[PDB]
Amino acid sequence: ILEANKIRKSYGNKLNKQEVLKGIDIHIEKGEFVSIMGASGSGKTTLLNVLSSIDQVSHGTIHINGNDMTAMKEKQLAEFRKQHLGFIFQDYNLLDTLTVKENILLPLSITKLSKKEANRKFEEVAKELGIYELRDKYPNEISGGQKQRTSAGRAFIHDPSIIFADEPTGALDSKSASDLLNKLSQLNQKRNATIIMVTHDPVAASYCGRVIFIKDGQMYTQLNKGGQDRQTFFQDIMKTQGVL
Amino acid sequence: ILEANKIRKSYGNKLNKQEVLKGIDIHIEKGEFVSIMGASGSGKTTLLNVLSSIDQVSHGTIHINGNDMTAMKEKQLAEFRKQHLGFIFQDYNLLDTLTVKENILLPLSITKLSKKEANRKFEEVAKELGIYELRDKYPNEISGGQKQRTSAGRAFIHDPSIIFADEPTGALDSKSASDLLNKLSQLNQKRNATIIMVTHDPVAASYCGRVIFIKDGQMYTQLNKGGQDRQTFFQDIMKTQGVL
Amino acid sequence: MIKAFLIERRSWIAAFLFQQALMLFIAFVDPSISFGNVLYMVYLCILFFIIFLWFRYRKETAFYKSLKTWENNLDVTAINEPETPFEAMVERSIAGQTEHLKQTAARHRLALENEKDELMAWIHEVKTPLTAMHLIIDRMEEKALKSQLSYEWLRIHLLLDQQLHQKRISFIENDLSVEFIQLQPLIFKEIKDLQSWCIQKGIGFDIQLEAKEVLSDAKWLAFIIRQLLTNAVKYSEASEIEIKSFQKGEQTQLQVKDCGRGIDPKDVPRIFDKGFTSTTDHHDQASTGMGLYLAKKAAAPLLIHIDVESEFGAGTVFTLTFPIRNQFEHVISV
Amino acid sequence: MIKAFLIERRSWIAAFLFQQALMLFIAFVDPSISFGNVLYMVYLCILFFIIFLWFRYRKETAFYKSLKTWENNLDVTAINEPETPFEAMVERSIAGQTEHLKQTAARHRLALENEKDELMAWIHEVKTPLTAMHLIIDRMEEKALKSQLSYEWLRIHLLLDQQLHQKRISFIENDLSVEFIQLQPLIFKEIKDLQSWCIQKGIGFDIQLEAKEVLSDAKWLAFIIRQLLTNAVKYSEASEIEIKSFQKGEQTQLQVKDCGRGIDPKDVPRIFDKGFTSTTDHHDQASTGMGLYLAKKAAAPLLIHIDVESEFGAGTVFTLTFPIRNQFEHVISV
Amino acid sequence: MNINQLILRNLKKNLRNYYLYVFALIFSVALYFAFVTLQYDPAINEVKASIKGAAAIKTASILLVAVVAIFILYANTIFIKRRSKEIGLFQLIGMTKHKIFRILSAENVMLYFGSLAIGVAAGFSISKLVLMILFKIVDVKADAKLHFSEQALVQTVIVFCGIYLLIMIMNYTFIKKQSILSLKKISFFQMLIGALGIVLILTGYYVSSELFGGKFKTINELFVAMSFILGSVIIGTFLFYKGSVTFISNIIRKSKGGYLNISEVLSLSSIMFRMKSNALLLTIITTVSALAIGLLSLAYISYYSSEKTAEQNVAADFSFMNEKDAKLFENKLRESNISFVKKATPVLQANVDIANIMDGTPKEMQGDPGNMQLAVVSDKDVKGVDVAAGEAVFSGYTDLLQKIMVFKDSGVIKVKSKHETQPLKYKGLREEFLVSYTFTSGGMPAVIVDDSLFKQLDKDKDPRIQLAQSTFIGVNVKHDDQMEKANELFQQVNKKNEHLSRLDTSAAQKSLFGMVMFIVGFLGLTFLITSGCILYFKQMGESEDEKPSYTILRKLGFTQGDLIKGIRIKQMYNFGIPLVVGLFHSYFAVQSGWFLFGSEVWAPMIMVMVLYTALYSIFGFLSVLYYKKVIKSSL
Ligand SMILES: CCCCCCCC/C=C/CCCCCCCC(=O)O[C@H](COC(=O)CCCCCCCCCCCCCCC)COP(=O)(O)OCCN
Ligand SMILES: CCCCCCCC/C=C\CCCCCCCC(=O)O
Ligand SMILES: CCCCCCCC/C=C\CCCCCCCC(=O)O
């Protein structure tokens, strides 16, 4: 959906200046699960800040479903991102003083929607993510995987189009990580929604359909999978990450 | 050395009863490198968990080294699990603040073996796994194929009776996978030590002597290999997997 | 739990209050001790004691409320983990009683398994004699007495098969096997099994199978066909059974027609009920009235609809609607 | 349990000590109040508090130790009636758990009795057609075919009788009826019942009964005698079975002897075990091997001693020692 | 979602976590109200000393309010940084920056004002206990009454309202500054830093060991050594935490080899990683703790020896300089049914040279060494010794002057008479005193000469340095009787209060130092209760930022019974290291000028240090409780 074209971020703090990004070009379509992998020190987090409209940009044209984030004001941009985007972070941000249901229903409380639709949306999300039985527990007494699954389900209650997601595997073991990635892949197929993961773990990236390797200007290689069986793709991504 | 008869585990939410073990009976002779593999919705992981002391038995009995440990007790079960049954998890589980030698020597510090015996044991163990040149590195500086070897050395140092390996080579490249499997086979060959290993990769399990194909909580035949080369046993394993 | 806690601890409170009352009372008999200062002391002791009582209340009245929480509604794990030694023993006793109940349940399960195993032992020890008797019977020469003996043997064989299928309807879930079935060999086998009844009752078979391939469970389909043929033979005399199979849309249907007495319309919807026996004829007492119920129960997972059309004095029509081929992929794959 | 009580009530002791310290401090800092009277009061109150702690210890320690003795013992009344509300709550919870366990156990037992009754009804409805075939088939003409059919029917009837008595061995005590029994007519009836097998195998009988009258129950004794005769016939080939009954002292001895293959001495002690089958010949696989066990178990309430004397290659002697008449006096009265 | 419910739930969560903050607020408000009520009481005027008595409570209040304000502001800036994830999430959801302010400011005003209202009501309740405590350190037989003193209410309300206004202004800026974001090996520098820190601290101690005595023989050199020592000690304390702990811990770690157990793992990791970050905080805590302990101990040392110094300053129970006043006092004592002992001894003010007798340095000038003023008395009037010709005996001990001016063995003393000089020798030094401090300069001893020699010295009697009265008419009293009646009789003898008694000086000294002891003790208690909470909060954060480690360890076989055992040692080291350094600072501060105050030490320091350690430990245990709470929920 979004188009990356000559995306650059200005700098110039004190006297020393660095340009982390030196040319960015991506053209992707709905129903994709791209992973923008890379290397340490390449400013991938800076790419998240620029791409997620969190940090203001200076050069380049980016069109979110035909809408450019430089074509409106800061308040309008904030409303656009709050009504058309969703976020998942490395560490879950869950209030302790609320329930597993109220945590998921908090984003759609200010919009002033009738209770029945919100209840139906939570019901279907919790059933399709497998936490409906934990309907009214507290985040104090649930496992490590369920907290991250709840955080992921929070970013699906308002039906967005692009799901930005920093590394959702930092504080999870292998079983929970595999379960969460399987749930995300199931979410992608059912409802059309673009997911842009950014992680440097080949195990997490092997679940995707497209991998982009950023060296200094995001042009190193581009794997495409196509018809692999989640193991040959794993070896391919390992070889590509090890060649450099 | 292991002996279980009519084991049955009922995992439910006190509202729905879904048994996953249907009375599995297994015999393992001391000094055998057996494997458990088959399907993806079975209870082989649960079978490996219940063979150890991490999970109890709802119906049946298991004997380890003749010593019955089915009646069980928390303070007794913890002591038994600490004094035997070395484990190799799927994850590295290495303390980052400590070096490569402290992690190996830590489990042995609750026995007070002075210093000379501990140094001699570490010398003997590290001479065979080829990590002796890494006595002072930190875990955030060595490759991803050596932390698994360090974990295996940790599990092998207090000479337990039965060693439970749970998907050791699941997140490694082919070269390091083969190296680690060869090291495990050599260690088993030299000193008598039973290893029970759960794998999803046929060439990883080709190094074994016996294979058990758990299917839907049942037995579904057993292989024995014997006096055959690794290649023919590999092809037989692949064909048997294809039949299922 | 204010009143309960106060009644629980009404001796320590009395001890402290008696202490301070004595301190006040020794102020009226000793001229070397004033009154205002003693009042001040008692005032700084009352305040401290009140605060301490409130804190000890709110700490200690938790476990005995969790106990009432767990008692009847739900949440077997409602009771809080013990912190003081006294509550630990209560928790241990409750857990011990619960595990004793679990052990009793396991013993009852073992007893049920043993009883069921003895049941199959008797089943096999009875099923061998029927085969032996059939082998012995297939050696005779006379007509009428031998026909009567064959009728009795077939009746007992059918009854034992009904009993075995009733036993197996509990484990049909783990025994289902769906494959292509040829209707003609199955119908011929059922006719051969029921040869003696048809010979004695003078009942023929009209085989007109436009459709020759069906998709269901072969064993249970044969069971249903045999039961329908047996019912038609028993409830009809000097009549020909017309068995017609035709393809309607994408689903195959099989029709069995008899020219017997028929079923009264008031009892037609209740024919499939368990244990139902008609009071129209005294001979219906010998019929167990269990074949139709078992057939309907077994046909439901096979996506086969059973319909009955009976008119008194005309006959009865039974039709089985075989499911579509595509509907079994969801059963094989899941 | 001293430590377990002094660790559970540390807060109140600490509060009391702090209050004493506060009183002493405020008395010290003020010139009006003296400093000997407060010290004497502190000493006296401390000793009284020690006595009070002992008194409080006694009751609660006694009750809780009684409760802990209740949880693991064979005494359900070991729990004392609660005196404080917390113990009332604990007792109420335990009573509710016990009530639930009793309800579920009673439901389980009643259900299982229901399937047992249904199974018994099915057994009756299965054994009746055996009598139907007997009535139909007692008209045969050919000698060899009739002999074979009679042998098979007798074997099936013996199996059904063994199953019936296995079912009734749980209520044999409720079926006992002491009466005088004429041994000769019963033995003649048993011999005539086994006529087909002896005709097929050429087995004769010698009857020499010195003792004619015994005191026992008709049905169970007849069942035991029939089982012994059936075993003797099955384990013998073309041999004459001799039955001798003579009075030895005050106890009646009944001897059953056959000239068959006998019983191996190593297997002699193990014949009485349930389901024992001789491995010498494969023809014994079809035999249940439970008739001897049923007879031995039925002989115990009848106070009848069963003796075995067997020789390999010669035969087996079965001896039944009937009890004295006066020994039934204590059983009949109760 | 009914924001009121969220506010209430947040407040309920806040109360059960930061309860030490509430306790500190209540204690501070109560103590401030107590001092302000005590200041305005008209009964405070019975405290008579050099300082007025009602003008020291004002200084105590002004000192207390600043400490309370600093503690409150720092605690409230610690609290707000633990609520950054919530603010970031609320900004992502869609709330503005003028609603988060209200949401997390309405759940704080209720807590603050509840504490303020409760503290006042428990402050009218301790306002008489404070009075009674004060009227026992200074011996006064008055009475204390219970009242309200409404001025204290106004002062307390105004002060704490101002502090809360500062808190709110500080909070608003942080909220209006947040962005939507935020949602090894030893070098050659740390070694030098640690070495410099230890060397500087040791040098400071060694320089502080000399001070009063030896060098620094003026007023513009001593104030250089004091500044040097203070600066060196503070800088050494600061450099100790940055580098000198990492060095020692690194040596200890790379001395075991590779064999480490659970306790060593936890302790070494925690200390090495975290003790460096908080370097300015621990320095302040250590220095202020040392200052408070040292000042309190010195005040107690001075107040302890009042009886002995009063008995030493005046030789007899009463001292008289005028014959008319002495005879008047004896006349009033005649009809009081009290009998007395009177004795008089002439005294000669003569100067001699004793420059050859000290073992120190001639540079200890303190007057002309050839012109020291000494008191000369005969031997006939003395009833204790029988001296001979050419022999001189001194009087008194006066521990202070011994270190300032050491005395050697027998030498020669040249008498600086008008036109003659008879040499004598120093026989020995006594310990009793025979002349009041009026005739013996500051504390200089007095010489004893033979009667025959005195018969020539009094013949000389050079009138150049003689005092107003060369006589020592001093009356004594009989065995223990009513001394107080004679005390007021003596008081009314001198309307000009020119004579000296043996009770008024003691009472004045005791009052003057008792007030200081009172003030310093209460400020020290407040500082202790203040620092404990800050350390507790820092340890709370440290414990919450280590939960993963416990989870990993709990998979290899270790149980909670070992994790808690290791946590015990960790907390012991963490709360004990800042205490021993403060104890050493205070102990080396006390044992350098103790002789300037009293004559007996080791009695006060042990008591003060024991009290401080007990309170510090009772603050220490609650951290172990919190760690036990955290470990359980890390399965
Ligand atoms: C003078 C020498 C001082 C030395 C230092 C002593 C300090 C040590 C002690 C403080 C004792 C505090 C005792 C209470 C601790 C209990 C911990 C706790 O959990 O309290 C929780 C509540 O906490 C509170 O409300 C504490 C608020 C007041 C703290 C205690 C202070 C009372 C008044 C202070 C004394 C005033 C006079 C002082 C003069 C000496 C209970 O759970 P919950 O919040 O109701 O449940 C949550 C609902 N979902
Ligand atoms: C000076 C008059 C009294 C002032 C108020 C008292 C200050 C608070 C004292 C203690 C509060 C009660 C302590 C809480 C109970 C738990 C203590 C424990 O378990 O040991
Ligand atoms: C001179 C007086 C000394 C007073 C000593 C006080 C002793 C300790 C006082 C009370 C401790 C209360 C502990 C309650 C905390 C509960 C822990 C929790 O649940 O968070």
Numbering used by the authors:
A (entry chain C), B (entry chain B): 3 to 246
C (entry chain E), D (entry chain D): 1 to 334
E (entry chain A): 1 to 183, 195 to 646
Question: What does the original paper state about this entry?
Answer:
One such mechanism widely found across Firmicute bacteria involves antimicrobial peptide sensing and resistance membrane protein complexes collectively known as Bce modules. These modules are composed minimally of an ATP-binding cassette (ABC) transporter which defends against antimicrobial peptides without transport across the membrane, and an interacting two-component system containing a sensor histidine kinase and response regulator. In this module bceA encodes the ATPase domains, bceB encodes the membrane-spanning permease domain of the ABC transporter BceAB, and bceS encodes the histidine kinase that phosphorylates the response regulator encoded by bceR. Previous studies have established that BceAB mediates resistance against bacitracin, likely by freeing bacitracin from the lipid target undecaprenyl-pyrophosphate (UPP). To understand this critical membrane protein interaction and the molecular details underpinning the Bce module flux-sensing mechanism, we have determined the cryo-EM structure of the complete BceAB-S complex from B. subtilis in nucleotide-free and ATPγS-bound states.
